[PDB]
Amino acid sequence: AHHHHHHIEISKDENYSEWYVQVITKAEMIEYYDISGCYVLRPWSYAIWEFIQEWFDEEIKKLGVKNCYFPLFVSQSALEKEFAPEVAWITRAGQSDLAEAIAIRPTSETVMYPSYAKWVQSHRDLPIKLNQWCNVVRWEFKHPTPFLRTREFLWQEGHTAFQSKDEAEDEVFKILDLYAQIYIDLLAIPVIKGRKGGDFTATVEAYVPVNGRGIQGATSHHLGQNFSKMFNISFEDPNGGGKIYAWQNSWGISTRTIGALVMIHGDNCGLVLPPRVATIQMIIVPVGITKDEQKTALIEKAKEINNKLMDASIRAELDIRDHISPGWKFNHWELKGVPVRIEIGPKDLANNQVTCVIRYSGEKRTIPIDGLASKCKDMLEEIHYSMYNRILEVRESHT
Amino acid sequence: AHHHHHHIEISKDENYSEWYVQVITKAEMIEYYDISGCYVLRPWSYAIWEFIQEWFDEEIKKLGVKNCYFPLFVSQSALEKEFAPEVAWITRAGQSDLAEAIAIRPTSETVMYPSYAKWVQSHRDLPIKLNQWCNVVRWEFKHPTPFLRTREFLWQEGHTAFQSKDEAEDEVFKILDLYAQIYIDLLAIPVIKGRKGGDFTATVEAYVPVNGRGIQGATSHHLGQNFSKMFNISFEDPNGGGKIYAWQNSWGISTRTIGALVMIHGDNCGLVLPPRVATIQMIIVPVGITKDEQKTALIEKAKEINNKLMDASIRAELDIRDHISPGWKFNHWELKGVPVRIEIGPKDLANNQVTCVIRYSGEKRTIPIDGLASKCKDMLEEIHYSMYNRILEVRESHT
Ligand SMILES: Nc1ncnc2c1ncn2[C@@H]1O[C@H](COP(=O)(O)OP(=O)(O)NP(=O)(O)O)[C@@H](O)[C@H]1O
Ligand SMILES: Nc1ncnc2c1ncn2[C@@H]1O[C@H](COP(=O)(O)OP(=O)(O)NP(=O)(O)O)[C@@H](O)[C@H]1O
Ligand SMILES: O=C(C[C@H]1NCCC[C@@H]1O)Cn1cnc2cc(Br)c(Cl)cc2c1=O
Ligand SMILES: O=C(C[C@H]1NCCC[C@@H]1O)Cn1cnc2cc(Br)c(Cl)cc2c1=O
Ligand SMILES: [Mg+2]
Ligand SMILES: [Mg+2]
Ligand SMILES: [Mg+2]
Numbered sequence: 074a075h076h077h078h079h080h081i082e083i084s085k086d087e088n089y090s091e092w093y094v095q096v097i098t099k100a101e102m103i104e105y106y107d108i109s110g111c112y113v114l115r116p117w118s119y120a121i122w123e124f125i126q127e128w129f130d131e132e133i134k135k136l137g138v139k140n141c142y143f144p145l146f147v148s149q150s151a152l153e154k155e156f157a158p159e160v161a162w163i164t165r166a167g168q169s170d171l172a173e174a175i176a177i178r179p180t181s182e183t184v185m186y187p188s189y190a191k192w193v194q195s196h197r198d199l200p201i202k203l204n205q206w207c208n209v210v211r212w213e214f215k216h217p218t219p220f221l222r223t224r225e226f227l228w229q230e231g232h233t234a235f236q237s238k239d240e241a242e243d244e245v246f247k248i249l250d251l252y253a254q255i256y257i258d259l260l261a262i263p264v265i266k267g268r269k270g271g272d273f274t275a276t277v278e279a280y281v282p283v284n285g286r287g288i289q290g291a292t293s294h295h296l297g298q299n300f301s302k303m304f305n306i307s308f309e310d311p312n313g314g315g316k317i318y319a320w321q322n323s324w325g326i327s328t329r330t331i332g333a334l335v336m337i338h339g340d341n342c343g344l345v346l347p348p349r350v351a352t353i354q355m356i357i358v359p360v361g362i363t364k365d366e367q368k369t370a371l372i373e374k375a376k377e378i379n380n381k382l383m384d385a386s387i388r389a390e391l392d393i394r395d396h397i398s399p400g401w402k403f404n405h406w407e408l409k410g411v412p413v414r415i416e417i418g419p420k421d422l423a424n425n426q427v428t429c430v431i432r433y434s435g436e437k438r439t440i441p442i443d444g445l446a447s448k449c450k451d452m453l454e455e456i457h458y459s460m461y462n463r464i465l466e467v468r469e470s471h472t
Numbered sequence: 473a474h475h476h477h478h479h480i481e482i483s484k485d486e487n488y489s490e491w492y493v494q495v496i497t498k499a500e501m502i503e504y505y506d507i508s509g510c511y512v513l514r515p516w517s518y519a520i521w522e523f524i525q526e527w528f529d530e531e532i533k534k535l536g537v538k539n540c541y542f543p544l545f546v547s548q549s550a551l552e553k554e555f556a557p558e559v560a561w562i563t564r565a566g567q568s569d570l571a572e573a574i575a576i577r578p579t580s581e582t583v584m585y586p587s588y589a590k591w592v593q594s595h596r597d598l599p600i601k602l603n604q605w606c607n608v609v610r611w612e613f614k615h616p617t618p619f620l621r622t623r624e625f626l627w628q629e630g631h632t633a634f635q636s637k638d639e640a641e642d643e644v645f646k647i648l649d650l651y652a653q654i655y656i657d658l659l660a661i662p663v664i665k666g667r668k669g670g671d672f673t674a675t676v677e678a679y680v681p682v683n684g685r686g687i688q689g690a691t692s693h694h695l696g697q698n699f700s701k702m703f704n705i706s707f708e709d710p711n712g713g714g715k716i717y718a719w720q721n722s723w724g725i726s727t728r729t730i731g732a733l734v735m736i737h738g739d740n741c742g743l744v745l746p747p748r749v750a751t752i753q754m755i756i757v758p759v760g761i762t763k764d765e766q767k768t769a770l771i772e773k774a775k776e777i778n779n780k781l782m783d784a785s786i787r788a789e790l791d792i793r794d795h796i797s798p799g800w801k802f803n804h805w806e807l808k809g810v811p812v813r814i815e816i817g818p819k820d821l822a823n824n825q826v827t828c829v830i831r832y833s834g835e836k837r838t839i840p841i842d843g844l845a846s847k848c849k850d851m852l853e854e855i856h857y858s859m860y861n862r863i864l865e866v867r868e869s870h871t
């Protein structure tokens with residue numbers, strides 16, 4: 074099976090739910106697990122989350138947010154301050170039954186806010202801006218789907234507290250725009266910003282052409298003073314007003330991002346990676362291979378190109394495995410969605426050129442080796458915006 | 473309490489266990505949590521883990537290791553292939569009792585290796601080199617201690633599989649040396665490499681001067697073929713030998729690293745941060761402050777210095793809060809272990825110099841502003857090696 078060619082066995086436009094399973098399995102993104110609704114994130118899909126993590130982590134740090142880590146556990150009575158058929162319960166640990174069951178966090182408000190109440194002694198302690206990258210568990214009763222609705226998933230959740238409503242409201246929309254940027258500028262997915270235990274909730278919605286539905290892609294909550302009154306997160310007003318309750322937001326985005334990417338950009342040849350989150354942006358494949366002197370000169374030139382592409386900060390890799398055919402390589406990296414295949418054979422070598430095959434469109438482009446690296450940087454940008462505009466044109470048609 | 477001065481209330485050499493609690497609380501490293509043996513990682517301590525994570529993640533990627541994410545859950549019968557009084561058990565989820573309890577992973581061998589068995593169809597599928605940054609849970613029956621022995625902790629665990637014993641054994645010792653480098657070159661802690669369900673186990677041991685004990689700082693396992701026979705991770709030998717079982721290692725380091733740092737470098741003034749894992753390496757504090765024209769010229773020069781230190785890639789920050797005294801600032805950043813305080817007042821300003829106060833030793837150094845940034849880069853190196861050599865001299869004395 075591994076060293077054999079592979080086909081997406083059903084068309085996206087015929088049965089998208091079965092097509093979806095084909096793509097995520099044949100592109101080596103997940104493994105099914107014997108605990109239902111949990112899925113292994115294989116490196117090919119986990120790398121996409123790492124790119125999102127690295128980007129968003131840099132952006133919120135510019136806003137003053139610091140990372141932390143709160144516990145996985147919340148006691149039953151602490152959870153039930155302020156859904157119940159979605160909680161996993163620990164009732165035994167070590168050698169003893171617990172007198173009170175412990176919940177796995179489905180979200181961390183009731184884990185974090187007793188500490189926020191302790192940390193806020195005066196307005197000088199505000200703002201508090203904390204984020205954590207972590208796993209949460211929701212025993213989802215709707216049917217689980219890899220990435221889109223899983224019972225364990227990875228996310229970040231940010232939890233912020235301010236001395237005034239206006240600071241908090243301003244951050245809600247900055248965060249919301251950062252979430253839109255993840256979809257638009259990292260995943261090439263157009264989104265709409267909209268207002269859905271808080272004062273107001275805003276999401277980014279990603280339209281899915283094949284079924285006409287919208288993916289709730291991330292959530293930004295303005296909690297007002299609802300949680301700060303619940304947990305007594307308060308300070309003395311400097312201007313005589315007495316006890317003032319902190320103004321709070323929380324916000325989160327998950328590995329559902331990766332399911333949106335599959336649903337929207339996947340096609341009948343398999344995954345199509347948005348270039349900015351592709352762990353391999355360009356795969357270099359030797360083609361048309363006799364002569365010992367020729368095979369060396371050709372592989373040596375491929376190594377040169379590979380180094381020149383990485384010098385230009387392109388994530389290029391070379392596939393010079395000889396126990397497997399070029400045609401198998403084409404198919405493997407197509408199924409996995411590598412944005413560009415660079416083919417180099419004897420004919421192209423003699424013309425000091427390569428042949429680039431663009432995955433999302435199938436276009437073949439012959440390019441001189443001279444200014445190649447710069448031409449490839451441009452091409453990866455071209456692909457990103459073309460992927461985006463193609464979905465945007467589909468959405469602005471149905472709407 | 474927050475805007476007041478604070479003292480470590482008991483000496484390290486008098487009661488190190490109570491001294492330890494003083495330091496980790498007053499340096500804002502942790503919060504105690506109402507589930508026993510779990511502790512909040514506040515930003516000041518979580519940033520240390522982030523530095524270790526970023527460094528080690530870069531090193532194992534050079535060895536070909538890829539990141540992934542396997543589930544939190546392992547079914548009872550899968551765990552009990554191959555300690556029991558240390559497992560947290562889920563017995564109810566959503567609306568139903570489970571027919572079989574689910575364990576929180578205490579480690580991920582039994583979560584991962586059924587997938588390894590599926591992925592290894594031939595020797596061409598090897599090596600497999602996977603790592604995950606994640607949380608695990610052990611209901612530790614010995615008494616829990618922040619960082620050193622917690623019931624939830626963060627770690628990485630790497631799990632590798634090779635076609636030959638020699639490849640696997642070579643990686644065991646490369647990983648072990650990377651763990652030694654974390655202690656030696658990031659935390660300024662000398663370690664000894666030693667050989668403790670595997671074929672052999674190697675650890676790095678950090679000597680703790682105040683009580684004479686050794687911290688098991690990380691673990692590198694050579695599993696041989698024990699787990700690959702258990703899980704049938706095997707391939708056909710190309711040379712006629714028949715079924716061959718993969719040769720496996722696993723290896724892990726946790727947030728226990730941070731407890732070693734506190735135990736070994738902490739002193740009676742509080743935390744002392746090894747410079748290479750200090751989120752603030754240098755804190756700039758205006759001292760000796762009347763004149764509106766003078767206060768601006770002094771804060772403006774401090775901002776200049778701060779920018780020049782960051783241009784040199786030094787993690788400098790400026791503390792120009794005016795609602796709190798310089799003496800409070802000295803004490804706050806000492807308790808938190810900032811490697812160097814840079815004091816600038818009117819007298820130094822007129823001599824175009826600053827006064828640096830080195831935290832681990834108390835030494836005060838007057839330095840011209842001219843070549844300051846380069847002098848500070850050197851100083852942070854000097855501090856790292858001096859911290860290391862001071863502990864090494866203590867260990868080579870007791871031994
Ligand atoms: N089970 C899940 N699996 C994966 N991602 C999820 C899951 N539930 C929520 N998310 C994502 O996490 C984000 C923040 O969480 P949250 O606001 O609590 O979601 P939610 O209101 O429960 N959404 P939903 O269940 O789809 O109606 C959401 O915007 C989703 O994109
Ligand atoms: N409860 C814990 N809290 C924090 N770190 C831990 C804990 N248990 C183990 N570690 C660390 O994780 C590393 C890898 O885990 P592992 O090899 O399974 O530890 P171990 O054999 O159970 N050690 P120990 O319990 O101290 O005898 C160890 O080398 C420790 O440094
Ligand atoms: O999880 C939330 C609110 C916000 N938390 C921080 C990240 C962004 C997120 O939108 C809403 N929510 C969603 N699902 C839940 C499921 C359960 Br089970 C519980 Cl107890 C609670 C909740 C619950 O509070
Ligand atoms: O966890 C290990 C072996 C290795 N796993 C990968 C990271 C490095 C680590 O040394 C040993 N170990 C330690 N403690 C355990 C506690 C329980 Br509970 C269980 Cl079931 C199993 C174990 C168990 O297997
Ligand atoms: Mg208060
Ligand atoms: Mg939900
Ligand atoms: Mg096999």
Ligand SMILES: [Mg+2]
Pocket residue numbers: none
């Ligand atoms: Mg143990």
